[PDB]
Design a protein around this ligand. Structure first.
Ligand SMILES: [K+]
Ligand SMILES: [K+]
Ligand SMILES: [K+]
Ligand SMILES: [K+]
Ligand SMILES: [K+]
Ligand SMILES: [K+]
Ligand SMILES: [K+]
Ligand SMILES: [K+]
Ligand SMILES: [K+]
Ligand SMILES: [K+]
Ligand SMILES: [K+]
Ligand SMILES: [K+]
Ligand SMILES: [K+]
Ligand SMILES: [K+]
Ligand SMILES: [K+]
Ligand SMILES: [Mg+2]
Ligand SMILES: [Mg+2]
Ligand SMILES: [Mg+2]
Ligand SMILES: [Mg+2]
Ligand SMILES: [Mg+2]
Ligand SMILES: [Mg+2]
Ligand SMILES: [Mg+2]
Ligand SMILES: [Mg+2]
Ligand SMILES: [Mg+2]
Ligand SMILES: [Mg+2]
Ligand SMILES: [Mg+2]
Ligand SMILES: [Mg+2]
Ligand SMILES: [Mg+2]
Ligand SMILES: [Mg+2]
Ligand SMILES: [Mg+2]
Ligand SMILES: [Mg+2]
Ligand SMILES: [Mg+2]
Ligand SMILES: [Mg+2]
Ligand SMILES: [Mg+2]
Ligand SMILES: [Mg+2]
Ligand SMILES: [Mg+2]
Ligand SMILES: [Mg+2]
Ligand SMILES: [Mg+2]
Ligand SMILES: [Mg+2]
Ligand SMILES: [Mg+2]
Ligand SMILES: [Mg+2]
Ligand SMILES: [Mg+2]
Ligand SMILES: [Mg+2]
Ligand SMILES: [Mg+2]
Ligand SMILES: [Mg+2]
Ligand SMILES: [Mg+2]
Ligand SMILES: [Mg+2]
Ligand SMILES: [Mg+2]
Ligand SMILES: [Mg+2]
Ligand SMILES: [Mg+2]
Ligand SMILES: [Mg+2]
Ligand SMILES: [Mg+2]
Ligand SMILES: [Mg+2]
Ligand SMILES: [Mg+2]
Ligand SMILES: [Mg+2]
Ligand SMILES: [Mg+2]
Ligand SMILES: [Mg+2]
Ligand SMILES: [Mg+2]
Ligand SMILES: [Mg+2]
Ligand SMILES: [Mg+2]
Ligand SMILES: [Mg+2]
Ligand SMILES: [Mg+2]
Ligand SMILES: [Mg+2]
Ligand SMILES: [Mg+2]
Lengths: 51, 100, 147, 204
RNA sequence: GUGAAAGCGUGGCCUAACGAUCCUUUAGACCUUCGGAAUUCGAAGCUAGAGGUGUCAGAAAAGUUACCACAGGGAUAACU
RNA sequence: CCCGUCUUGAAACACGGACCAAGGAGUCUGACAUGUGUGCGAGUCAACGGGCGAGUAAACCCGUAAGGCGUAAGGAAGCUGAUUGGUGGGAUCCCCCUGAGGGGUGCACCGCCGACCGACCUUGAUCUUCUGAGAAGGGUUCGAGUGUGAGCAUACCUGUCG
RNA sequence: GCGACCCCAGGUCAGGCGGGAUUACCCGCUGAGUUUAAGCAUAUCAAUAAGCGGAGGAAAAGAAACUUACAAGGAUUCCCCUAGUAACGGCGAGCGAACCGGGAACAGCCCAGCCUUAGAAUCGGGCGGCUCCGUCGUCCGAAUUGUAGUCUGGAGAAGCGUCCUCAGCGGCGGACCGGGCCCAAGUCCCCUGGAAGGGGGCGCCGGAGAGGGUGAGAGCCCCGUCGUGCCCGGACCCUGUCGCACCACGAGGCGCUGUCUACGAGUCGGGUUGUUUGGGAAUGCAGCCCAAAUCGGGCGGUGAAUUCCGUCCAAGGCUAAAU
């Protein structure tokens, strides 16, 4: 038979987050990369990194 | 059609600008034909004559029923503008016919 | 987000939150705006007064550009001047800045609020209210008309 | 229908699902149009990629008459004033619009200067290699004969700076609101006043 | 209006005797609009009434089926 | 006493159900609304498109008088368009005093009453191009108004509607 | 009776054209009801499904009888916006465009009519030759009830002089599209196992750690993958360069000139009927009736007369791109 509520291509796939929020997210990520505790917490092996 | 006063309201309103006459165009003489075309149409009128309703209009103009002649013209042609132009044409034909 | 939809919390509860007695039938009150005068009369009168009927004159082929008339108030006029020009205004009291509101996308000047104290301004606009002109004049300014 | 809500007016009673236009090809359309422009630029090299020169025209209606934009093509009157025959203009990157009228001197003069500026920085290669004819350049075909990308005579706004004037007693006494009310009144009574004046002539 | 006057009178001594939208029609305002600009007709608006919905919060509406059909109802007849 | 179900009432002499496996029902989308999270804020939004770019359907950049919503309302319309708060309670803080105390401070919110803009009505010194201007002075009228903005984008639940 | 022309007939006459198929998109016609309105008839579903036709890689549309009322825009198409707006609607349910503005693309043109009359200057067919998508010669036809040139309103004809512009093919290369071929590094040692492609050890390639195959998780066993190099072909378009040729008689451009200055009819328009549209004293379309004009005609979203103003030039035709 026919499935319930058949999936349609015009589902709203995409999202447009405001540009200023996207820039906010990038800046936070860049700042987090300079914190060794956060970099280690994400699973990176930076035990021999000079700085 | 005076130059604009420079105010946004009132008569002759609008932004101040130096107006100039539009350059002449060939289409300005639309509705005018050559002398030959007038000659051809005049000759064909003699050969063809007048239509039955045109004969009715001129008969009314002979008895002086100008108002009724115009109403017949409007019923036939359709518009008042064309009806009164047609009546004047019939009057011109009759005017120079009684003088001959 | 399907996992937050409350129907998921209602799995295993038979009626899916729509009751055993009343049930969830197709259109038990008609579709859309049906019965606006008959069985939804109270709803329309209580929440939508004026809904039914006709008022005013028709306007065939009404173009909105003819009616374009953005307005700016007196209190907002000073904010249009650039900051560097504001300093010049306070540096020489003999002259006054010329604020052409049309250059900032405004046609008419309304008269809400007050102008900066001790600062004459020459306002250039298509239209102006009488209160706006009075406030400009009493501050030492003047009004010029344009189009 | 229930509660206090805006009256719904969804236009979804036809077979709308058969007329849905998706935009999943939007990135592909951008790619295809960019490729077409890139291909066109090489075809017309060294002619500018911006295309033909367009005139400056005013926006239409009261809402947009304060701005200027690119029009279709230069009017015949503008071309004649600039001394460029209309049949030659399209062959040297000048758009021609035989329909546009010129109601004012300012509009005519603005585009005439635009044409002269364009001709100042226009390099025309000869039709045949060696022999050089009128209108062609000489020694400039190699110096600065490059394909210009983007606009070369942009149509932009030049907002005037705030000017500080001296307030004269004449301007202080001017009654702007009174002027507007008087002008409005004279406009809507123009017909009635002209009527009685004509009727007075009949009596007199 | 009435009474000398206080005062009384916004229908009937009090408790019933009546009617939306749209449309039509009338009254009123040296009123507004017909959007290229005018004049006069015509039309369209604004305010207050009238023409009615008695199933009276107001669809425009005759039967028959023993040839019958469907969704239901023990919310409801024909047994115990 | 047999579960499920409609029901005032089911173990019912009310209906479904012999048994097992697997499949099997509030979803997607448009509009709007309240609430909450986030960004910015009298602004906000990269949305058509362009410039590009992980050799790339992503990400990144672009709003020059673009546009949407907001920033001003009232009126059928012609049109006109906010003179910029008083008071009773009240959070917090400050001082005195150590009382269910007395002063200063008075945000948010609520009650009460003015003023301002507009429809309608009313009013008119003094002027004017005769129909407009407006010194003063208004109203048991009316408004989804003003009296130092709060919006815009976005995410999701719930609700109405197609 | 013999001839010319006209109309028609026959032909297995010589040489051509047409039918049918396909459905995603496209063009024309025809055309419902379920449904919604909590009933129902206008309405809505829908100018949709079904039905009947016709095309192409796109189709259709297209160079204003336009928008607008502004300081004006300027063929068509398409996107955003306009806007769920003006409007329409048992003004109920519902329905609903357009202009401006911002963008994608961009391209303009051809006829009919007065104008060879010292020459039908035009075209087809048969036959023949050549450098063969054509061209030349010759013959027979078409055509004066008009072929070719000139002209298309933006103009133009004619006259005058400024003395500006205009005449081909070929060789090579690039660009473009398609294909073919070669080309990196372990299968080293131990253990488990039917099998190592697994674990441990020791190495290597990497502009190639996409993917697949091979007896289990394989960059290095195999095909490929990355990046060059080499080779072959198709389009004849665009473009660079070289060689040869290069007659301005004529035509065009520019300037001036008294004069001339031809533009689509049972069509426009009007009445009426039906249908359709947001189009409302009537948006388009169609039937029937009436039936134009040439200093004129159409439009300017309320019917009508009068005075102006703005605007365009229908009743013939072609046309790439954005979709
Ligand atoms: K519920
Ligand atoms: K698509
Ligand atoms: K009833
Ligand atoms: K049950
Ligand atoms: K039962
Ligand atoms: K049972
Ligand atoms: K609600
Ligand atoms: K904005
Ligand atoms: K931009
Ligand atoms: K009113
Ligand atoms: K031949
Ligand atoms: K493998
Ligand atoms: K002609
Ligand atoms: K019609
Ligand atoms: K005209
Ligand atoms: Mg429960
Ligand atoms: Mg249930
Ligand atoms: Mg219910
Ligand atoms: Mg529902
Ligand atoms: Mg349906
Ligand atoms: Mg444009
Ligand atoms: Mg008395
Ligand atoms: Mg009574
Ligand atoms: Mg009544
Ligand atoms: Mg009425
Ligand atoms: Mg009009
Ligand atoms: Mg009742
Ligand atoms: Mg029956
Ligand atoms: Mg019972
Ligand atoms: Mg029971
Ligand atoms: Mg039970
Ligand atoms: Mg029992
Ligand atoms: Mg049952
Ligand atoms: Mg059973
Ligand atoms: Mg299962
Ligand atoms: Mg929110
Ligand atoms: Mg804007
Ligand atoms: Mg008023
Ligand atoms: Mg007031
Ligand atoms: Mg044969
Ligand atoms: Mg129904
Ligand atoms: Mg029903
Ligand atoms: Mg029914
Ligand atoms: Mg079909
Ligand atoms: Mg076919
Ligand atoms: Mg084909
Ligand atoms: Mg294409
Ligand atoms: Mg075509
Ligand atoms: Mg034309
Ligand atoms: Mg156009
Ligand atoms: Mg809106
Ligand atoms: Mg429809
Ligand atoms: Mg546009
Ligand atoms: Mg000829
Ligand atoms: Mg010539
Ligand atoms: Mg000539
Ligand atoms: Mg290999
Ligand atoms: Mg190893
Ligand atoms: Mg195995
Ligand atoms: Mg390669
Ligand atoms: Mg024509
Ligand atoms: Mg007709
Ligand atoms: Mg039909
Ligand atoms: Mg065509």
């Amino acid at each position: 038979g026919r499935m319930f509520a058949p999936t349609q291509t015009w589902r709203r796939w995409h999202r447009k987050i405001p540009v200023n929020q996207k820039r906010y997210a990038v800046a936070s990520a860049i700042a987090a990369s300079s914190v060794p505790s956060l970099v280690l917490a994400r699973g990176h092996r930076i035990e021999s990194v000079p700085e | 059609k005076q130059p604009n006063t420079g105010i946004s309201v009132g008569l002759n309103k609008g932004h101040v600008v130096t107006k100039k006459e539009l350059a002449p165009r060939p289409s300005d003489r639309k509705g005018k034909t050559s002398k030959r075309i007038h000659f051809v149409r005049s000759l064909i009128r003699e050969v063809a004559g007048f239509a039955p309703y045109e004969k009715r209009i001129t008969e009314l103009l002979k008895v002086g029923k100008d108002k009724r002649a115009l109403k017949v013209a409007k019923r036939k042609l359709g518009t008042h503008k064309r009806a009164k132009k047609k009546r004047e044409e019939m009057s011109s034909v009759l005017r120079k016919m009684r003088a001959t | 987000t399907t996992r937050f939809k409350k129907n998921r919390k209602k799995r295993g509860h038979v009626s899916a939150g729509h009751g055993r007695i009343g049930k969830h039938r197709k259109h038990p009150g008609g579709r859309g705006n049906a019965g606006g005068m008959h069985h939804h009369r109270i709803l329309f009168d209580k929440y939508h007064p004026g809904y039914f009927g006709k008022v005013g004159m028709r306007y065939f082929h009404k173009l909105r550009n003819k009616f374009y008339c953005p307005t700016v108030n007196i209190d907002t006029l000073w904010s249009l001047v650039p900051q560097e020009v504001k300093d010049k205004a306070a540096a020489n009291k003999g002259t006054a800045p010329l604020i052409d509101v049309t250059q900032f996308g405004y046609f008419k000047v309304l008269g809400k609020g007050v102008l900066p104290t001790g600062q004459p301004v020459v306002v250039k606009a298509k239209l102006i209210s009488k209160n706006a002109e009075k406030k400009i004049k009493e501050n030492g300014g003047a009004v010029v008309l344009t189009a | 229908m229930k509660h206090n809500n805006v009256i719904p007016n969804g236009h979804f009673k036809k077979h709308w699902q058969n007329y849905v236009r998706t935009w999943f090809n939007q990135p592909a359309r951008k790619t295809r149009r960019r490729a077409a422009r890139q291909k066109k630029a090489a075809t017309i090299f060294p002619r500018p990629t911006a295309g033909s020169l367009r005139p400056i025209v005013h926006g239409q209606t009261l809402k947009y008459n304060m701005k200027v934009r690119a029009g279709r093509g230069f009017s015949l009157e503008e071309l004649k004033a600039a001394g460029i025959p209309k049949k030659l203009a399209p062959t040297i990157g000048i758009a021609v619009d035989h329909r546009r009228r010129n109601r004012s001197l300012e509009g005519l003069q603005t585009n005439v200067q635009r044409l002269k500026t364009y001709k100042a920085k226009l390099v025309i290669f000869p039709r045949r290699a060696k022999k050089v004819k009128a209108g062609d350049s000489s020694a400039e075909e190699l110096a600065n004969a490059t394909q210009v990308q983007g606009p070369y005579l942009p149509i932009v706004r030049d907002q005037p700076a705030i000017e500080l004037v001296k307030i004269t007693d004449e301007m202080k006494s001017f009654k702007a609101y009174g002027k507007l009310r008087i002008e409005r009144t004279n406009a809507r009574h123009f017909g009635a006043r002209l009527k009685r004046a004509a009727e007075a002539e009949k009596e007199e």
